[model samples]
Target: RSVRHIAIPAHRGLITDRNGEPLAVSTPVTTLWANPKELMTAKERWPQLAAALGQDTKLFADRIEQNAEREFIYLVRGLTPEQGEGVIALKVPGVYSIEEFRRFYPAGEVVAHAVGFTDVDDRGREGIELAFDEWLAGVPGKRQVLKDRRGRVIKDVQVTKNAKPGKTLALSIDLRLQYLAHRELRNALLENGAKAGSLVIMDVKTGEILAMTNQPTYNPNNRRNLQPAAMRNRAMIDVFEPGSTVKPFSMSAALASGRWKPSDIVDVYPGTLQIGRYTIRDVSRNSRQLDLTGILIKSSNVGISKIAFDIGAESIYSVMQQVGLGQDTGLGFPGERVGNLPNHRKWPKAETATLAYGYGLSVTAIQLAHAYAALANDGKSVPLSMTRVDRVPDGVQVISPEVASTVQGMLQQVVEAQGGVFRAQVPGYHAAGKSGTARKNAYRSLFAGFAPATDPRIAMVVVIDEPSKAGYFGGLVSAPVFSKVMAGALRLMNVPPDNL
Candidate 1:
């Protein structure tokens, strides 16, 4: 018995949503090119060519004529079938096109950073395309056969060898969530007249990112107007002092050390304390005695600083290191950054104090969320991922279970409290997180938090670069963004309310 087999060249697969919505796909197009000699010979058709291409008569003629001296010339870039047909109608002898596939993003800039894009030659350029290049790139197809002297195939299977194609890479990102976040983040930037901003919402249980957004974003379709800074994924790339968000980490560390109790009281004198040469103060300037819960509810820098100092630098550093401070999560990103933890060996008084208050060091929003996750998940730290995970990875232990639970309870007040995390509180569900408003090295600001306090299912971060508002505090601006995003995210995931 004879068996027949067919081999196929691997091609990039279509990227569709869970509901079959096309996010990134391949479309056939003509890459118009010109042979200078042929174009020169067809100078008479230059007028027709110009008209067909919607190009200036004189300019098009000149370009075609000028290319006569060269071997090859790029007539134009990408064009649709209709456009290619129009060019063919011109009957320009020298102009030719090669059939090729180009990545077409029907969603356009909506999923620019998530689905990424490809180059003119149908090569992956950025985002998921670049991240999963091997899986998203095509394999060249070839026919294997014995050729006679006349250059004719004597016999062919169109297959002596098997051909394989690339698989379609599926992203865990939800386009609807992406668009909503983009709309809100953009609105925030425009309405507030902010310099820039980024908002990220991730699935706490699975580590899947729901929405990762930044502005001013560009139309990845047309990148000529893009600025270098505008293209960066601020949620992962940039690091700054995280302000009060670091307080939760300090509290978690303290709880883990067994040196502090949730009921423990600290004399936060007027929310200001002089540590060595520098004095740390709270925004409210209220000198009130607070319990462990009060420190976070009030977002007191002085109160947290005292606790962090008491817990000692070594223990805090150990916890931070375990939580991925100054480490990469191996997410297959090129510019992934880590936390900025300094050497404690040459520790200066100001450095220690500043570090305690999230000033001396820097951390990306991703890192901050991961740190919070360690507490929210009961001291278990999971790696962050943009792609869907087939199996969950074991979480790194950053704190003890008791410490995590203690801190989780206290931290929840930051949201559940009547006047605290007010903008971050969800009406039907219990959510807890700390807000941050830290200045950048030059002229920027950042905000980050994690929520669903007791059993966190979502973590978010919002950055507003140099707002025109009087006080660009996270509580006033970014906290509200978190609230709206979380409300929608919970509903989307069907995370039912605690009671209602």
Candidate 2:
């Protein structure tokens, strides 16, 4: 009989972190196959074959019967060399093994959301794996081989299509930082009794993602209990109302309009402002006048609403749009959500007030980090990148350099102020941040900030979803994660301490 053509799979590309640590790699494996037609007469030995393959005897027999007319069927895939050799030693009439490759994630769940996993056929299924599948998947090749009647390869015939290995992928993720984020987020979720959490750390100047992780994660290596819900990259894919975190942007808008300076005074007496049927007020009212900077330091909803009303919907909307609210960060991550930003046409005071206080809009954790990066980088809004960067690209200016500096100074007061997120401060560094706690069926605690405020190096965001214990406030639940992660990141990056 003429030789038959068999496909030879090529090695899939390796995925590594910024420092060249392997994240995803392909390992050699053996796939056991059966020629049901050749084994039709060997039905009596089905139990032994089933035992060797660790399959149910009755089910194995039924599968063989169903495919009796077929020349070959996959009995099992991804067996170790020892396992395959053990099976071959059994010399089952219809059983044989073919060389193949299986994807392995050495980092396991630590970076699962970012690196993603491949299916049994070595095809990318989600995350970076799916985003760059073509570049990571190999080209199959064909080879003619002489086989025995039992479908076992007896001799090689001729080369047909030569297999080509996939190209390697280098990501901007720092493995060390990724592990730290994963551990800290997991701990925070357990400590706070929260449902889920997300964290993203980025380089302020280069736009490279240093680390990104999500809780409720699954191990790509051991996927037996892997749930689709756990596969989500929450930092980039999930959206939430940012609460007080939106106040800084509002402050930026006010400052950019030349209508309010950082030191401008606004009366928040009794700390309640009624707009339409909705009343906006802080959790605890000081019943005193506050400056523009005091508005952010105290996270005063009433103060920010007044600023938004004065600037008008169009001006406020323009500023939010400039800072990338309700837009994608362009990281090209799979299933990323472009958070909702409402267009303001009618000058409705209630809607404007709600928008100012972060109720009428939503943003992803990465988007929040991206917006804060603008404040950290002197008004330059760099697009987020997951790949390693050779140079920092110039970005659109969302605010003037003077306004950016003003907002940065104001946020610094948020961390240092007695009523603000003082817990967000790093021991040896100047950290500027804002905290937000919003309720939408469930509470979402958020903290967005940048470190080494005078000469910024990194900007980060942390979110705790549905926190049930240890206080649900953003300063309590989410700010600690930001503080711990940023402290380590700053020291790791060796940015000289600006505070101490």
Candidate 3:
């Protein structure tokens, strides 16, 4: 009975933004425990102990007596440092407090999906927490101590194991960009009365995710009534048909095939096209034929489908797969879904044409960002990362850099023309972007592109799901979010304005 083994709790690792701002941290707390047998004999001090714990003397006494058979019982847990100090100051015999830890998220719901919360015993449960649980969890240590007959600690005999604290984790997200994206995305979700939404900002060169936000978020600090769906990281988990957002990539594929050049004329007269099985109509009515650039600027499904016919189906699938569609974004994030990129024994022109015009395949929001990032990175498909990059990996060249630049210029024309997304302009910068609307189960309005048409720095994507009001066009609903965040991120990161 005199020799006892004491366990020491280890502190969890710290989670911070790239700039070293604390996002999720382990906060110190005090848990009070008592030796029931020793405490029962301390009769006179019972009244003081009851008042210290704000407990009725009789009720407190009954509880202790109920547990009298046990040598130890928890009187209370989770007291603040100040409160623990005040209670311990009473010096009641046999009553003691042990230092404990509680996980605290400073950014609350702002970074909920990025930095997940720990369970009651501080085990990693979701998001980054679940992804890197082993790296962020500390192992408890044990030591031998000798106590006298009165249960008074005498001396530490020996230490069996030393408690090792978790290593620090640095995220790729910048707090400034994170807050900006969160506010704008949340505002758009509410204004459009949309069911859900997601926004992603990434460094065009580094492959680091600067900011990611999803609507219907939950506060990690106060998890009451938290739904499982609310914890989802939509950017990584939710997949959609991607609509017109895939047009720029399709154009890149068309150019890579060398079957048609940028100046090649596309005859889309009557504004509709009939495949073997189905006919598709363009949203913008144009009686004349359009060039490659015109196809992207007008987002002409007919023009793109015509190009797909000549370029063949393999090129389309090849480019999409090369740009990270149907693959993981390299983060290995928990619950991440690799959207479908289908394959068939032989080609169906109708299916190929539909795929060319941004249907028949599904992609997640992060994958959309990665595809755009590949184009922005001079046709290099750099793997996306959530942690700070100590060394940038050499990526595979998917499209020719020359072709990506050509498509980039086309995208610039789309934004510069003030096609409803005119508000996407930054007063001092030249931006290149594209707007997309997918009529899935509900209307998914999306905007995906980059900024500084001269030298692109950041590639971004925004999705407003199921927008029933304020219009459902991508330019109308999603472009503004991309515009504001890209503008701020460029300025904050000290990228020079090409226009100014």
Candidate 4:
């Protein structure tokens, strides 16, 4: 008798959190299969088996006929234990169950955008799964056996090929923080009647991403309602004009240029500026003289633009590069993007002016958080990571510690000043941050900052897209989200309150 071969599927690896909590795991399952030629004699029993499998008897018969040339075919895949037992009771000719693996997610949609999901055949389809598919996918083995005249396994022989399982992956995500970020982001999206939102929290000391989540999310365990929009990791993939959030970087540039002081005044008497055919105006009509610190506190476009032009375009561009703009965080995420930062050499006066105040450029929430981390870490630019680090990462200095401290003081004033981000203030803790509201047919409100300004530990970014209700300004919409998320994160990390 000729020998028959069948595939023995290998188990995929588990994806766990930093604390060893399983996020994605493989569960054993059984698949019902048959040899079409052997099943032909049991044709009359096809309807009985089809009824048990909850499939159309007529369609099932036609499918078997179409695949008649094949030696084996799956009658049904991923059968539950009860379903598998029920099928075995039928004992129909040529029908048997084979062991296999199915992917399961314990955290469900809460961690969907980060952990990602796999296909029916146990292959990764999106997010981290897709990014590390080769490392997570297993190689199937072959088994040689002898079949009876009825095409049923009778004697088992030696394995023809050995299976190779996937290696386990440990992620940097802290599930507790992930849940906190997800809950707050969802609530904010609903409260503001916003189209979408994203939040990111990074460990300033180590550059490990503690938590990241996006709204309009979907459950990875449920495949029926999966949409492409819900599968994106917006914090790392969606790019937007950062609005006033870019002001801090510009402040860093000005201070680094050796041409301006935190107290040096720039007069915006009329509150408006003109560059050739284009004109720039402040959000508030009336304005007085603003120094570099005053420019950030008021988020004055005219004040920052004058400073940017005085410092020259190349210097500003260099500052942006030093802060990690136009660069990927190097997590190698499946769809990660390095946002657009146009070369300043080609920029005209109008473009340079807009770039200073956060137009004519783009950045993802992760990049924004990373830039803020540079400030929080005393001018050291740390590389972002998706896996936990055993030691603190060595960082590249984007600005001198003196300059970073100056910028931090100015940002702290932004949260404390009456005209600045009062909504972003945390009780008993000193917070420093910049608020951004960008308009491009739709509004994007953003808040980027770090907590405990005196001794920074956590840096974060919140982005609320197209807020139709409540207020659209970053201070009004996204700042509160930052305050809530950062406060809880601070306590969770047990960082002492700087203000107290």
Candidate 5:
């Protein structure tokens, strides 16, 4: 009695949203293989096998003949039920079938940038898949059996080597919010005639990423025509000058300094300030006397520059660091970026001035969302996490709660005030947000905000790149998406209406 050992294929884990909704799943499938030399010897059966796969009969024969140099050749990949039945039971010699698992994503391109895709060998290639590849991949097992001379199994024994299945992965993503973020962002990009965009939603208290998505997306199920440009998760990868969006961080610094107060007067008489070769100017002429709150409400670059010069870059840069700017979010996502944050004291007034109004700095969409979340969470910096959290971890106090609170109140008026980002307002919620229209084509509009002004829970960031129509300002082009998504998400999540 000759003993035989057969290896059994192991199954990978299911990738799901926090609510256990399948984002990625493994389905059993078959791959048909043939001994090309032997298949060619039974040449009469070529047409039948070729017809099963809808391949041209003549070309398939030539293909088999061309590859006869090898004994094994793939006859059909991704074999389906009907086709596999037609070809597998054709009584054709030299044909064999092997069981395999194929990954399927029901959510499609809506969640493509997050769930990611896999390779033919069932290994991860991108996004969460690549980041947690080993944690979700199982080991193949073996079985013991007695076989006959022609490799026919005479008696099958119980499994010897048990297969270790991959553990299920649950992400912090809320599918409900993910759908809203995707649809609204996609429609906004299309409506504005924009080139690309990114959107991220995060829980303010726990720092859990509720949803993240990007435009110029692709279908993971069908990647044969994928473009490299569309593969990037821009929410975590691409960085751009935040412009006025970061004015809030500088405002925080100004509030913390003993020299400046929220009500302190800043005169930008003609709405412009000169520093050597550069001149900081507002889009519209501002009043001669303005407070820090009014400065944020008007998004006055000149006003913020004066604040930067008064308190110096050390305070501004320190506050930005505490708010999670120019740093990795600790999410461990593939291709994540830490935006540029320039430092070194004793610089030109123009440089520090520009830095105050968000020129000498850049931040990715995710980083911006996290930063805003910290501000909204009363200056507590909770580490960002992609996986679900049963219990929230402790947070580090990044800035004085008083400063973050004051700055948050100023931002709330940025949306609620007459000279502010009116388009960013949610109909029934008090939203605090800042908009940045960066670059000189020539626009990267960004909006980051949190909702329920008194007690913020959800924070979001939206970026629109290269809008050619309607308008290019962040309030005009980018804030609407944030408003719609936030409004819908808050209602869906059952957060009570604070404004009403």
Candidate 6:
């Protein structure tokens, strides 16, 4: 006869905040697993268990009586320590409680969309948990002490080799910013009666994700309220047409080619643009012939389209690709999606015309934010990151530092100039960002913005899906969310005002 053995080990490590605070940690939980034969043999003692543990009588009775079809049964999941002790005190029948580690999110739904949660087996099923599963999970610990026939410990001894702790993961997210963003995002969604909303704040210089929060979130600790759709991290996963958010990229391409300057004037002809058979209109109907800076500040589609043609489809497409569009960011994220942009050959006609003005293409919020970061920080492209960053990652130069600075100057006008995202303007600090209000694709509205017009420190985007009113513009629906979150975050970091 061959001897058989099962090595039961303790589970893995947790993901923590930069301060070593557990964001996703394992808690000692007891699970109620039953041996059917033992349970059926002691069925007479069911009332003691139900009464001692405060269980639903019918539910507990039904679960215990379910010995007809299976050899084992689970009476309840996540038995609290007190409840487990109560069950033990009863000493009733075949009920057995096993101590196991369960993953927990202390912040509950506050970080549901960002840190993500796992399945009952402690496996990460979504978000960061899913992406860094291998790094975050530890080996199960083995119980080496053996018990006697009377269920008494015959020899209490520690195992020779100890279980290794799971690697501690530090994210760039600041809990303060995350909480503030959640508070502001929820407020915006409620005030606008929007179906859902999301926002991401990134450090422009380092490409670190500082805060990402979503509405309609679920508590990771208790998923009783979780809907399958609500569990998805829409801020990084959702794709939208970006509306005027993309204008800045085209503007970068234009300026990079030396084909257009910010001071150059383009006759927009009352905001209606005609190219071949397609005619494009700007959101601002009264925006007359505008200068290059005015075009971006006002989000004039006609003016941007003119600039795109001047820069050509190939040049614009090339620039977008360089800025991490139409491709996966290669960041360690599960189920990440690469956005859609046309092939150079596909951008011949009206596609080129629409492409110039933030149409015929899509970008994830992260991609758009990163692209803006490139423009914000002297034309360097850095990989987007979610882990706590000690040293800034290296960047690949995408545009001349001089051109990037010029674009930053133009971006500043979107907040600093009159009739721009004035609400996003900080009282004492210089801020700059363009507002994007693209028509919701697939029944959801899209909005994105980023800031610190000259020397970029923080860049962020906000999207409010399916706003119930005509006021679905980015400036109307999402600009305030961005403003509120950023203002609090900057102050939390003790960022000095521009005047100071």
lDDT on C-alpha atoms for all candidate structures: 0.71, 0.87, 0.86, 0.87, 0.87, 0.75
Query: Model 3, 1-500: lDDT tens per residue?
Result: 49998998899999999999999999998898888778878878888899899999999888988887776788888788888888789888788888888899999999999887888778888889888888888788898888766555679899899999987999999989999999999999889999899999999888999998998899998887868888889989899998788888778888888787888999888888887669877898754778887888788888888888888878888899889887777688888999898877787888778888788788999999999998988888777889888799888898999999889888888888744358577668889888899998579999998988898889999999999895999988988888888888898999998996
Measured with C-alpha atoms, the lDDT of residue 277 in candidate 4 is: 88
In order of appearance, the predictions have TM-scores of: 0.87, 0.95, 0.91, 0.96, 0.93, 0.89
Candidate 1 lDDT for residue 418:
62
Per-candidate Cα RMSD to the true structure, in Å, reads 5.0, 1.9, 2.7, 1.8, 2.5, 3.4
- The predicted structure with the larger lDDT, 1 or 3, is 3
Q: Which numbered prediction scores highest in TM-score against the true structure? A: 4
Question: Positional deviation of 161 in candidate 2, in angstroms?
Answer: 1.7
The ten-residue window of minimal lDDT in model 2 covers 146-155
Worst 10 residues of 5 by lDDT: 147-156
**Inter-residue clash pairs, candidate 2:** none
The reply for model 6, stretches above 4 Å from the true place, is 1-4, 37-47, 50-75, 93-95, 141-162, 286-288, 441-449
For model 5, the stretches where C-alpha displacement exceeds 4 angstroms are 1-7, 62-69, 143-160
Candidate 5, residue 14: CA error in Å?
1.1
After best superposition, candidate 2 residue 87: deviation in angstroms? 0.9
Stretches off by above 4 angstroms in model 4 are: 3-5, 146-154
lDDT of 6: 0.75
lDDT string, candidate 1, 407-435, tens digits: 77776677777668787777687777777
TM-score of 3: 0.91
Q: Model 5: how far is 45 from its true place, Å?
A: 2.1
Clashes of each: 4, 0, 0, 0, 0, 10
Ranking, TM-score, top scorer first: 4, 2, 5, 3, 6, 1
